[PDB]
Design a protein around this ligand. Structure first.
Ligand SMILES: C[C@H](CS)C(=O)N1CCC(CC(N)=O)CC1
Ligand SMILES: [Zn+2]
Ligand SMILES: [Zn+2]
Length: 229
């Protein structure tokens, strides 16, 4: 099921949904996988997260051209770390409109990232303010609260059982919560639980650093995050 395309891996998760995986040899951490999503919505393609680098992100676009052959209407990125935003310049060079949490765009320079072109804002209940996410099709964007980072956002795919937790959620057998340098230790557990409650019917939880898992990923993540309080 894992289609190798250069140094990247693509896996179909549902009829109109694929996971993209790219790797970076991070000193002290090994060759770390990061996952994002590709969604076909009718005659256009929507991307969730870049790869780690511009070159890898350009290869995502190449794979899309070969396997889907429809224009990429937009990309949404889920926080201002390199695994999610490292390839912004490649999207811009391709003419693709980009979106991130306003706070991700604010943080991007100090995090070493290029900001997305458009800023999402969120209602008090966590759902994106719809005027800031126009033409998002089946992508349902939710801010669960600060957790992995202050700016982390999540995305459900309407018409599927899939919800994407990004770097907020770890798999149900993960040994730790990973990179906590920017984490909100007080609020992480509640934010993880809020993601689960926003997508109550999602049975396939996609995450940045592990293969897709069941809903046990959400409760295991929250349990690990309980230990940070
Ligand atoms: C660049 C990313 C931004 S989340 C990062 O800081 N990582 C270090 C921790 C590592 C944990 C793991 N191997 O699952 C994931 C990659
Ligand atoms: Zn991160
Ligand atoms: Zn990450």
């Amino acid at each position: 099921g894992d289609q190798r395309f250069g140094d990247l891996v693509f896996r179909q998760l549902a009829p109109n949904v694929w996971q993209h995986t790219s790797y970076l040899d991070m000193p002290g951490f090994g060759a770390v996988a990061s996952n994002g999503l590709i969604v076909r919505d009718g005659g256009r393609v929507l991307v969730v997260d870049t790869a780690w680098t511009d070159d890898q992100t350009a290869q995502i676009l190449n794979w899309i051209k070969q396997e889907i052959n429809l224009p990429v209407a937009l990309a949404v990125v889920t926080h201002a770390h390199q695994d999610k935003m490292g390839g912004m310049d490649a999207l811009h060079a391709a003419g693709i409109a980009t979106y991130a949490n306003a706070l991700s765009n604010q943080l991007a320079p100090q995090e070493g990232m290029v900001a997305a072109q458009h800023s999402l804002t969120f209602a008090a209940n966590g759902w994106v303010e719809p005027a800031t996410a126009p033409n998002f099709g089946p992508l349902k964007v939710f801010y669960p609260g600060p957790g992995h980072t202050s700016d982390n956002i999540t995305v459900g795919i309407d018409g599927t059982d899939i919800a994407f937790g990004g770097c907020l959620i770890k798999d149900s057998k993960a040994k730790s919560l990973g990179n906590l340098g920017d984490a909100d230790t007080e609020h992480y557990a509640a934010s993880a639980r809020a993601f689960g409650a926003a997508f109550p019917k999602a049975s396939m939880i996609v995450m940045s650093h592990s293969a897709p898992d069941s809903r046990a990923a959400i409760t295991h993540t929250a349990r690990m995050a309980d230990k940070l309080r």
